[PDB]
């Protein structure tokens, strides 16, 4: 009869016939990941094509129901999600060209091999040939050669492709009632129709700038300290008044600063909190690691893992005969089937990764009650954030002492807290200016603020202004320096890390306040607190049914993203860095003072 009942029956029909197809596609993807064979690749391709065709047909049927005659929030949200054209609105020739461009960029990035001229008999790929050199070398010219050669080859190949890509994506986005592709990406956080909890696409950029302005003093002090330490490591290259050289950040692109912990350690004499040896001595298997993680989740009050999880997951490397992807990934296959694919080793990093992926599994399990098309996070930030909070909680010394991995008589003095906080800042705080600068540059490129002939002149100017990183040598317009990163080349949003980082500490403050922790934020563990788990599970159960603003109100009590928990987390480190930067000069100059 009415439009709302028709939409509800159609949505039921969609969820029922879409859950099984999604399960088949996900199972084919799992079979490919755990067993890399040509038939598995063919099965994955066939399942993906069937899934995409079914989604296209259901979207085509879905568009015939007008949005304005539906009052139920969940039904309206599912209809809005289904009725998106995506690439369908574009012409078949341009759609095929866009798909071909994306695939060829994927092949060029994945199979890109670059080596030194005059010695071409063998070459090194990016992983792990170039990663180890970027992360461990202390030689200026070798790192400079690797960075410049890889950007030269990849940028020169990808620059016309990127020029076509921006135009095609802008055409698709403007055809889809968006201002640009940046507006399309910013539409994920858009909330419409809820009184008081509405969020606009335009508000996201303003909020990011407002938070980053408060991020800037801490980043400036951290940059000054890292600059001083790198000056100690490399005597003549780094200038006291200028920016840091691009190839010296410890990674290929500057995404993380975690590879500079050895060079920039405050107290080298003091020991670390490494617990790898304790697990090796007591013969801790990967199964024990996952059982301890499960014990942590039942300690906080969340449901324990299913029998299917233990039976069907691959938590150890299979062997030489069977090939598998080594990247840790949590799979929500559908129909209550949750698995983790990780090549787990006896390391602290794998243990934290196991907690992070099991957090992903818990998040996936929580919204199983919801309809199929709403079985996701409220935004892209929350899904990563719920894993990151478990990663934060598991790494604390209190958690290690509780589970027996650390000695009960370990002395927790201020120096270990300072060096640990500095390492966490290098991993977490350091990615924020790079992420903000890259997303703002991409948004300006999509918007048309920056013409194609002026992409790099602005970009380096942005990098000096925001990231405090200077180019080693000037680059002309033949280079395509941003596209050397995995996320940008394969059509992925990059603001998820920034939102995840702010949400991570907001959630951490909320759970620690719930758990009645009375000390520093970084010394807080969320184990043994039922109320904290209940508060988290209230947001977790909703999934995508409710706006992200309402979920944030449910957890932290705020209607907007906030920057204060990050500053509160690193406040001892902030005071220590302010004390240590009395002699040095905080801030940088955008000029070519170190090298150009």
């Amino acid at each position: 009869s009415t439009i709302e009942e028709q939409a509800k029956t159609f949505l039921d029909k969609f969820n029922h016939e879409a859950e099984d197809l999604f399960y088949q596609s996900s199972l084919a993807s799992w079979n490919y990941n755990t067993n890399i064979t040509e038939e598995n690749v063919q099965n994955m391709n066939n399942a993906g094509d069937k899934w995409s065709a079914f989604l296209k047909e259901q979207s085509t049927l879905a568009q015939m129901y007008p949005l304005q005659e539906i009052q139920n929030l969940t039904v309206k949200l599912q209809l809005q999600a289904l009725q998106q054209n995506g690439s369908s609105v574009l012409s078949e020739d341009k759609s095929k060209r866009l798909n071909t461009i994306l695939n060829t960029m994927s092949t060029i990035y994945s199979t890109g091999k670059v080596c030194n001229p005059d010695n071409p008999q063998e070459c090194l790929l990016l992983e792990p040939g170039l990663n180890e050199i970027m992360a461990n070398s202390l030689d200026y010219n070798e790192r400079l050669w690797a960075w410049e050669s890889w950007r030269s080859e990849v940028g020169k190949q990808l620059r016309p492709l990127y020029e076509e890509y921006v135009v095609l994506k802008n055409e698709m986005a403007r055809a889809n009632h968006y201002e640009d592709y940046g507006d399309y990406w910013r539409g994920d956080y858009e909330v419409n129709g809820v009184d008081g909890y509405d969020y606009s696409r335009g508000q996201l950029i303003e909020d990011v700038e407002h938070t980053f302005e408060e991020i800037k003093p801490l980043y400036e002090h951290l940059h000054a300290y890292v600059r001083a330490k790198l000056m100690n490591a490399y005597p003549s290259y780094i200038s006291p008044i200028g920016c840091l050289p691009a190839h010296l950040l410890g990674d290929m692109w500057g995404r993380f600063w975690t590879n500079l912990y050895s060079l920039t350690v405050p107290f080298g004499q003091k020991p670390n909190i490494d617990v790898t040896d304790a697990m090796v001595d007591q013969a801790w298997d990967a199964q024990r690691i996952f059982k301890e993680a499960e014990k942590f989740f039942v300690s906080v009050g969340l449901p324990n893992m299913t029998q299917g999880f233990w039976e069907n997951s691959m938590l150890t490397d299979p062997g030489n005969v069977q090939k598998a992807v080594c990247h840790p990934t949590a799979w929500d296959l559908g129909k209550g089937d949750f698995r983790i694919l990780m090549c787990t080793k006896v390391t602290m990093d794998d243990f934290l990764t196991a907690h992070h992926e099991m957090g992903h599994i818990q998040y996936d399990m929580a919204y199983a009650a919801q309809p199929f098309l709403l079985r996701n996070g409220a935004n892209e930030g929350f899904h990563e954030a719920v894993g990151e909070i478990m990663s934060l909680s598991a790494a604390t010394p209190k958690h290690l002492k509780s589970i027996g991995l650390l000695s009960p008589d370990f002395q927790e003095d201020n120096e270990t807290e300072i060096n640990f906080l500095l390492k966490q800042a290098l991993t977490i705080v350091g990615t924020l200016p790079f992420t903000y600068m890259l997303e703002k540059w991409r948004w300006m490129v999509f918007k048309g603020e920056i013409p194609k002939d002026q992409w790099m002149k602005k970009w380096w100017e942005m990098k000096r202004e925001i990231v405090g990183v200077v180019e080693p040598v000037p680059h002309d317009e033949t280079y395509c320096d941003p596209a050397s990163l995995f996320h940008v080349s394969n059509d992925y949003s990059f603001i998820r890390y920034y939102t995840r980082t702010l949400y991570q500490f907001q959630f951490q403050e909320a759970l620690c306040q719930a758990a009645k922790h009375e000390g520093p934020l970084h010394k807080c563990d969320i184990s043994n607190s039922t109320e904290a788990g209940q508060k988290l599970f209230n947001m977790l159960r909703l999934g995508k049914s409710e706006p992200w603003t309402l979920a944030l109100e449910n957890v932290v009590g705020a209607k907007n993203m906030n920057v204060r928990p990050l500053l509160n987390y690193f406040e001892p480190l902030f005071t220590w860095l302010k004390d240590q930067n009395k002699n040095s000069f905080v801030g940088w100059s955008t000029d070519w003072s170190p090298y150009a």
Partner: protein, 198 residues
């Protein structure tokens, strides 16, 4: 579940203790009678309804419940006397390719009456528009297949449900429980109960 089997059990002795003492059943919820006194009481007829549902849908097989199964597939009366027995059947009813032999009625204009079987295969009309016999837009086929895989979760795994319905009618009750004989003792003054004569 749309075409649930009904078997009428009459003119025999029903031993309920074998079912009760089994550990193979996940749900043994009895409504209107208790399992302890089932082995003593006698009933006129026993209705055994058998079907397969999902793990999450076992709760809907009860009086007063609401759902797809209760409204459109199998409806139980409020004044129901009997037992609902359900057990996991992942071992037999799930195959690697997917077992799609089990179907459920997803849409019907009105709710089912208690103990009603609907085997109609007419296209459901969700809109004013005439369906015209073809399954197109706003017109859907009511019977939807089920997907059963051996790696599914416990809430999606197939569960076999047998519902026993006990009714007493004015006709003589013939489905009686197994009375247990004792050993015979002779030459002593004892209280004898022979075939109801005490």
């Amino acid at each position: 579940v749309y075409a649930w089997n009904r078997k009428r059990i009459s003119n025999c002795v029903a031993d309920y203790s074998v079912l009760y003492n089994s550990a193979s059943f996940s749900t043994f919820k009895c409504y209107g009678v208790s399992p302890t006194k089932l082995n003593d009481l006698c009933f006129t007829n026993v209705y055994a309804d058998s079907f397969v549902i999902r793990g999450d849908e076992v709760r809907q097989i009860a009086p007063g419940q609401t759902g797809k199964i209760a409204d459109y597939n199998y409806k139980l009366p409020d004044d129901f006397t009997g037992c609902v027995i359900a057990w996991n059947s992942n071992n037999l009813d799930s195959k690697v390719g997917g077992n799609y032999n089990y179907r459920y009625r997803l849409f019907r204009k009105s709710n089912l009456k208690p103990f009603e079987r609907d085997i109609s295969t007419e296209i459901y009309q969700a809109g004013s528009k005439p369906c015209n016999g073809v399954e197109g837009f706003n017109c859907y086929f009511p019977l939807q297949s089920y997907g059963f895989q051996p790696t599914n979760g416990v809430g999606y795994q197939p569960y076999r449900v047998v519902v026993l319905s006990f009714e007493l009618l004015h006709a003589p009750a013939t489905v009686c429980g197994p009375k247990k004989s004792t050993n015979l003792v002779k030459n002593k003054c004892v209280n004898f109960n022979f075939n109801g004569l005490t």
